[PDB]
RNA sequence: GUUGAUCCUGCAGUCAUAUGCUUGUCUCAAAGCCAUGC
RNA sequence: AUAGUGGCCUACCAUGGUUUCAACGGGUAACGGGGAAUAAGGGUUCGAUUCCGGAGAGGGAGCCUGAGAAACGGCUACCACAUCCAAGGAAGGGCAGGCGCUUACCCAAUCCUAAUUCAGGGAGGUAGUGACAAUAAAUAACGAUACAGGGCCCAUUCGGGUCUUGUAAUUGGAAUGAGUACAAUGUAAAUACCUUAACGAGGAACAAUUGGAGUCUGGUCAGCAGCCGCGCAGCUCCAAUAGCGUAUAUUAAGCUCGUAGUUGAACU
């Protein structure tokens, strides 16, 4: 409530409205984009150099964003931060099982003001049956998904697209209807990059090598909480890693001064102002005689009773200089203590919708924790008696496990996103979803119960007087373990009486019932061996 | 149509399974429409019973009540004295539908296959191919109940699905 | 309720029950404070699981038991149940007909 | 004109509020905030 | 005085004028009715009326055109009021409309006008919009053979009655149209609507449920020994049908007198 409340007041016209046009790359999104800026700038601009600042009135500034479905990371990255998702559809999607999984991504990141727009339906259909198909796709989304949504139907009038009332209806819905707040995004200061400049500290032999990082000066406008609150703080760059800011800049007898001037002793602060160790809890007082004489009278206490930024970096290093490009949009993240630190963390999980595989402990996963994403080996476990007694190596339809693994440690227990990577030539989206839930709880230095089974088959049994034909082969092991308590698969207690000088599996052992020949004498509580670290 | 007062009355629900299995129905609201049609008629018959004999309202509309029932085939000839329409039964209404009367005129060999015939643009009353199972036969088009000129068993076209079996033989055994 | 048929509240904590059939497993209750009133009332979760699903601190919807108060079976003293957490209609999440939002 | 026993039988309606699932074909369903213009 | 009689307005003179089968005065939140419908004509809905009247075009006054405006969808001036500024000045009237509870096309019709056989008509005509209701009905039809029967019902019972029955694509030809498409009609230019050559079934079909039960089948747990034991996944039946449920509420079993007040004999 308060974390959404701090966002509404300082933000005005120079912080723009976040616009993310996200759809399939096969469609002509660019015509609708340049049509949208034909509504903004007078009638005459149809060139794309985005992202860039477009000044349109004092009401709202609007910066427009785009990303293809062929890029994998920004498919994650734009979803948690967008105030507006504009989905354009073709007339042949809806049970396309490989290129529509981003809907679940926007679900798990949280739904902003989102849009469905149908334009290639004009290019595909030419009969009266499209009116039923429009309503059917409306029964698919978003009206199935969220109540109060609108489906926009527009013309295929490719280059040469209208300036007329339809773009004023789209921009009517964009300009009038505003967003809904997000919990942990507003808990952090985050800045999208707008202008990207590079300074090299002019030419020297130290300005280039195998390892040389230069002075990257980056610029833009702020969103969320104000980022200048502490200099030299930590930061995350998505896809590259964690860093700290080199220098932060922003372009939109006084005792309180005497405290934090550290070149002055505190006796000089008191002495210039008026007129040692806190390990002693009892405060200072005067002498018993002076305080007694002064407090002969008690009169003296008788009333006591009844935004633009200019940001400096000495990063990135040399290898990402070769990774320069026209800017596919990168937002800046924010690192925090009790989240920057590492630890074993336990997460609660469930299975993806329209998902067709099992999820094993041994197949590493990409994990979206806030602004972070880590490939990590997902070790599973379950309880069956309000405590851990077993573990599982894969994820069936039967139950759904809880994950325990060494990752980064995060106390506030953020929501969870577990994505399995596919290549850019397998299905059609940058990732395929494995599991989702919340970070359950924080637990380091914990140990998993890994129990196993020892096989012993009974054949002719009495209660206290019994032999097994084959469960062991050594009398010394049984002699070491005669003090233990042996079990049976139906739950019959027992203990080893003695190996009785027979290293053959025959040995005297007691039970509290005669063991069934359909039952098996077993042993549990086995070795808990270590976590996979990665 | 209208719903009855009791939703679960077992021997009442016994005979509803009897008639719908007899007459080849598919809904109980189909039964409820026939009873609701009867409910208004059998209402108005009591009102003319409260009137005097040879009352011209009882003479005009009471005998027009007769002639509408003599037309549809329900009312017999001997019982044309305004009292059998109080002593009626609902199965006489279910008798007069063309769904069963085509089976009463042989030719259908099932009460369920007959419904299958009706929906497939079969039997024309005269020149009028009808696709409504609730016609309430006019009692004079009964012998005119006959197949269409098309839609075979009335001939003049085999139909494309018989032409596929014609094509499956003439191309495989032929060329 | 104030005589009403439904009300909207927020989960503050999640309790634990147990069962007898087919084994002993937790059957789940919670404590939900009314938004309009501030009264915190116990509520039951009729399903298997769904302790996984609901949460602490979520804004939920409440309904009755259809016995005019009057706790159903061996559940001592609960008079209400949850049908919609976050307005998502639990049964939709029960098969997989819906996916839970950001919070 | 008055006491007891034996036998037998007995001891659902709501277009009226909100909500959920699904529908091949046909028909019928303010004294607040402002998009836009003079 | 006006287009025109006329207190319509003024100077003088008179003191009159209306009304108990009721002048005037007062209420009817229905701005006025004829009129359209169900058809008691009573009533209801509309009178913001399908036709006409009174009031308003930010608020005042004067004046103009036309046969006809009392133009305001005429002008000027005044008052409120506000946009630009080269700094001089210029200009518009506080107005619609949307949400809170997406509007496109044509003068082909009817009439009107015409600089009138031409053409136009913010007259007029066509298109968009959908479970609170609701209409018609599609999901399979008919044969075939072979091994086969501890088959069903009722009484939770103790038991009795009735054995015409299924397990198999064994398998076979029918068939229609959901949907795909020339041509024609229509033609506001014009679209839909009503027609129809040519495609479209052997169960993955051309993909229906919300449910209700269940003494069934499976999985190491309060807690215990001397001996014996505790409590998701496969299967079956029932339901109405594009319909059904849920929650709430609702329906059916101390004494007396004595005022206002009530009541009351017979009769040529």
Curated annotation (Swiss-Prot), chain A:
GTPase required for synthesis of 40S ribosomal subunits and for processing the 35S pre-rRNA at sites A0, A1, and A2. Controls access of pre-ribosomal RNA intermediates to RCL1 during ribosome biogenesis by binding of RCL1 in a GTP-dependent manner and, via its affinity to U3 snoRNA, delivering it to pre-ribosomes. GTP-binding and/or GTP hydrolysis may induce conformational rearrangements within the BMS1-RCL1 complex allowing the interaction of RCL1 with its RNA substrate. Required for RCL1 import into the nucleus. It is found in: Cytoplasm; Nucleus, Nucleolus. Residues 51-55 are annotated as: G2. Belongs to the TRAFAC class translation factor GTPase superfamily. Bms1-like GTPase family. BMS1 subfamily. Residues 154-163 are annotated as: G5. ATP binds at residues 23-30. Residues 23-30 are annotated as: G1. Residues 119-122 are annotated as: G4. This is Ribosome biogenesis protein BMS1. Residues 66-69 are annotated as: G3. Interacts directly with RCL1 and the U3 snoRNA to form a stable subcomplex. Component of the 90S small subunit processome also known as 90S pre-ribosome that consists of the 35S pre-rRNA, early-associating ribosomal proteins most of which are part of the small ribosomal subunit, the U3 snoRNA and associated proteins. The gene is BMS1. It comes from the Eukaryota. Residues 15-180 form the Bms1-type G domain. Changing residue 29 to A: Strongly decreases binding to GTP.
Swiss-Prot record, chain B:
Coiled coil: none annotated. It comes from Saccharomyces cerevisiae (strain ATCC 204508 / S288c) (Baker's yeast). Component of the small ribosomal subunit (SSU). Mature yeast ribosomes consist of a small (40S) and a large (60S) subunit. The 40S small subunit contains 1 molecule of ribosomal RNA (18S rRNA) and 33 different proteins (encoded by 57 genes). The large 60S subunit contains 3 rRNA molecules (25S, 5.8S and 5S rRNA) and 46 different proteins (encoded by 81 genes). Interacts with snoRNA U3. uS11 interacts with MPP10. Component of the ribosomal small subunit (SSU) processome composed of at least 40 protein subunits and snoRNA U3. The modification Phosphoserine is found at residue 173. Component of the ribosome, a large ribonucleoprotein complex responsible for the synthesis of proteins in the cell. The small ribosomal subunit (SSU) binds messenger RNAs (mRNAs) and translates the encoded message by selecting cognate aminoacyl-transfer RNA (tRNA) molecules. The large subunit (LSU) contains the ribosomal catalytic site termed the peptidyl transferase center (PTC), which catalyzes the formation of peptide bonds, thereby polymerizing the amino acids delivered by tRNAs into a polypeptide chain. Keywords: Cytoplasm, Isopeptide bond, Nucleus, Phosphoprotein, Ribonucleoprotein, Ribosomal protein, Ribosome biogenesis, RNA-binding, rRNA processing, rRNA-binding, Ubl conjugation. The keyword Transit peptide does not apply. InterPro entries: Ribosomal_uS4, Ribosomal_uS4_CS, Ribosomal_uS4_euk/arc, Ribosomal_uS4_N, S4_RNA-bd, S4_RNA-bd_sf. Belongs to the universal ribosomal protein uS4 family. One of its GO terms (molecular function) is structural constituent of ribosome. Residues 149-175 are annotated as: Disordered. Its main location: cytoplasm. There is a cross-link at residue 169 (Glycyl lysine isopeptide (Lys-Gly) (interchain with G-Cter in ubiquitin)). It holds the Pfam family S4. This is Small ribosomal subunit protein uS4A. The keyword NAD does not apply. GO terms for cellular component: 90S preribosome; cytoplasm; cytosol; cytosolic small ribosomal subunit; nucleolus; nucleoplasm; small-subunit processome. Residues 96-170 form the S4 RNA-binding domain.
Curated annotation (Swiss-Prot), chain C:
The modification 3,4-dihydroxyproline is found at residue 22. Keywords: Cytoplasm, Hydroxylation, Isopeptide bond, Ribonucleoprotein, Ribosomal protein, Ubl conjugation. It is found in: Cytoplasm. It comes from the Eukaryota. One of its GO terms (molecular function) is structural constituent of ribosome. Signal peptide: none annotated. Belongs to the universal ribosomal protein uS12 family. This is Small ribosomal subunit protein uS12A. It comes from Saccharomyces cerevisiae (strain ATCC 204508 / S288c) (Baker's yeast). The gene is RPS23A.
């Amino acid at each position: 409530l308060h974390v959404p409340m701090v966002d509404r007041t300082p933000e005005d016209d120079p912080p723009p409205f976040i616009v993310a046009v996200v759809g399939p790359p096969g469609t002509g999104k660019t015509t609708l984009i340049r049509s949208l800026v034909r509504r903004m700038t007078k009638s005459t601009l149809n060139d794309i150099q985005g992202p860039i600042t477009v000044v349109s009135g004092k009401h709202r500034r609007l910066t427009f964003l785009e990303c293809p479905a062929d890029d994998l990371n920004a498919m994650i990255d734009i979803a948690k931060i967008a105030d507006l998702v504009l989905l354009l559809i073709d007339g042949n999607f809806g049970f396309e099982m490989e290129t529509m999984e981003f809907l679940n991504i926007a679900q798990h990141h949280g739904m902003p003001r989102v849009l469905g727009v149908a334009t290639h339906l004009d290019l595909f259909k030419s009969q009266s049956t499209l009116r039923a198909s429009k309503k059917r796709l409306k029964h698919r989304f978003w009206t199935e998904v969220y109540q109060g949504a609108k489906l926009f139907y527009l013309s295929g009038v490719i280059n040469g697209r209208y300036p007329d009332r339809e773009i004023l209806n789209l921009s009517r819905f964009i300009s009038v209807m505003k967003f809904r707040p997000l919990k942990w995004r507003n808990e952090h200061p985050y800045m999208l990059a707008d202008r990207f400049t590079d300074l090299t500290h002019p030419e020297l032999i130290e300005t280039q090598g195998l390892q040389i990082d230069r002075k990257v000066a980056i610029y833009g406008y702020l969103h969320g909480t104000p980022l200048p609150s502490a200099p030299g703080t930590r930061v995350h760059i998505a896809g590259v890693g964690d860093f700290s800011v080199a220098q932060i800049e922003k372009l939109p007898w006084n005792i309180g001064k005497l405290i934090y001037m550290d070149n002055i002793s505190p006796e000089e602060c008191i002495r210039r102002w008026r007129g040692v160790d806190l390990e002693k809890f009892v405060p200072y007082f005067d002498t018993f005689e002076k305080l007694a004489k002064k407090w002969k009278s008690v009169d003296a206490i008788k009333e006591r009773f009844l935004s633009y930024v200019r940001i400096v970096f000495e990063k990135v290093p040399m290898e990402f200089v070769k990774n320069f490009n026209p800017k596919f949009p990168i937002v800046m993240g924010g690192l925090l203590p009790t989240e920057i630190k590492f630890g074993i963390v336990k997460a609660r999980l469930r299975r993806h919708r329209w998902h067709k595989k099992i999820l094993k402990t041994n197949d590493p996963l990409v994990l979206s924790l806030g602004w972070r994403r880590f490939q990590t080996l997902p070790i599973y476990t379950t309880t069956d008696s309000r405590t851990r007694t077993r573990m599982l190596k894969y994820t069936p339809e039967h139950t759904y496990c809880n994950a325990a693994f060494y990752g980064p440690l995060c106390s506030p227990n953020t929501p969870f996103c577990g994505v399995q990577i596919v290549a850019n030539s397998d299905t059609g989206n940058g990732f395929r979803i494995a599991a989702t839930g919340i970070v359950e709880e924080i637990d380091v230095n914990i140990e998993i119960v890994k129990k196993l089974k020892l096989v012993g088959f009974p054949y002719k049994i009495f209660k206290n007087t019994a032999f097994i034909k084959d469960m062991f082969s050594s009398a010394m092991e049984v002699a070491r373990f005669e003090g233990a308590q042996i079990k049976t698969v139906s739950g019959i207690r027992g203990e080893i009486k003695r190996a009785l000088s027979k290293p053959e599996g025959h040995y005297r052992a007691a039970f509290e019932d005669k063991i069934l020949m359909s039952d098996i004498v077993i042993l549990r509580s086995w070795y808990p061996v270590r976590v996979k670290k990665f | 149509y209208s719903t009855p007062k009791r939703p679960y009355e077992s021997s009442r629900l016994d005979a509803e399974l009897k008639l719908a299995g007899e007459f080849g129905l598919k809904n109980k609201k189909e039964i409820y429409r026939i009873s609701f049609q009867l409910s208004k008629i059998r209402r108005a018959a009591r009102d003319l019973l409260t009137r005097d004999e040879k009352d011209p309202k009882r003479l005009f509309e009471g005998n027009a009540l007769i002639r509408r029932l003599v037309r549809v085939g329900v009312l017999s000839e001997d019982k044309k004295k305004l009292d059998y329409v109080l002593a009626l039964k609902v199965e006489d209404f279910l008798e007069r539908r063309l769904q069963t009367q085509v089976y009463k005129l042989g030719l259908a060999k099932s009460v369920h296959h007959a419904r299958v015939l009706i929906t497939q643009r079969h039997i024309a009353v005269g020149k009028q191919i009808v696709n409504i199972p609730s016609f309430m036969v006019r009692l004079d088009s009964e012998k005119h109940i006959d197949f269409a000129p098309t839609s075979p068993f009335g001939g003049a076209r085999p139909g494309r699905v018989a032409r596929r079996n014609a094509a499956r033989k003439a191309e495989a055994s032929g060329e | 309720f104030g005589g009403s048929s439904h009300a909207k509240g927020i989960v503050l904590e999640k309790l634990g029950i147990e069962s007898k059939q087919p084994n002993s497993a937790i059957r789940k209750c919670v404590r939900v404070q009314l938004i309009k009133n501030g009264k915190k009332v116990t509520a039951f979760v009729p399903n298997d699981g769904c302790l996984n699903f609901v949460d602490e601190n979520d804004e939920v919807l409440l309904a009755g038991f259809g016995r005019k108060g009057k706790a159903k079976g061996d559940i001592p003293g609960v008079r209400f149940k949850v049908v919609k957490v976050s307005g998502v209609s639990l049964l939709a999440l029960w098969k997989e007909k819906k996916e839970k939002p950001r919070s």
